[PDB]
Design a protein around this ligand. Structure first.
Ligand SMILES: OC[C@H]1O[C@H](Oc2ccc(-c3c(F)c(F)c(F)c(F)c3F)cc2)[C@@H](O)[C@@H](O)[C@@H]1O
Length: 158
């Protein structure tokens, strides 16, 4: 089991950490959602699916910078929504293909009334998402750390 980003940065077998720089909707009005869809940014595969089934959870998701202070929201993992920042590890998703497939994670964030104009600053850390991988084969328990950075400013107009 291993993963890569959209620009080709890999976290190999055994886990690790990587930085992910995502483009964000530059304008989010009150009432709208800011969607940070990592399923187009993070991909993973199973290295021997005929014998081994890989299990993959979102173990923890933390918010930082303007996402912490200016938004309220949730994380959607494989069709289910949970609080964000997370309070517990999600259920497992099955990976059973050698073809790199998306990690189905997305943040759904809406501005709080006290949000400031410049809600997210370009280049800032906005989230840390931990992918935890196990299997039905041995005792492997590996954490893939995804550090999410904003590519651009996000403004919430009045
Ligand atoms: O994604 C599958 C596994 O890939 C790595 O662990 C491997 C253990 C065994 C084999 C393997 C196998 F199971 C076979 F049946 C083979 F024929 C073979 F050549 C293999 F290399 C490949 C990867 C780790 O990330 C682990 O954590 C993961 O579960």
């Amino acid at each position: 089991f291993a993963c890569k980003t959209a620009n080709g940065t890999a976290i190999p077998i055994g886990g690790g950490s990587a930085n992910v720089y995502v483009n964000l909707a530059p304008v989010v009005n009150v009432g709208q959602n800011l969607v940070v869809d990592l399923s187009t940014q993070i991909f993973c595969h199973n290295d021997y699916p005929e014998t081994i089934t890989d299990y993959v959870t979102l173990q923890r998701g933390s918010a930082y910078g303007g996402v912490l202070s200016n938004f309220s929201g949730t994380v959607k993992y494989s069709g289910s929504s949970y609080p964000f920042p997370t309070t517990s590890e999600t259920p497992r998703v099955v990976y059973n293909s050698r073809t790199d497939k998306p990690w189905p994670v997305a943040l759904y964030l809406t501005p709080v009334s006290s949000a400031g104009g410049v809600a997210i600053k370009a280049g800032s850390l906005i989230a840390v998402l931990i992918l935890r991988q196990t299997n039905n084969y041995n005792s492997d328990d590996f954490q893939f750390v995804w550090n999410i950075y904003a590519n651009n400013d996000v403004v919430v107009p009045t």
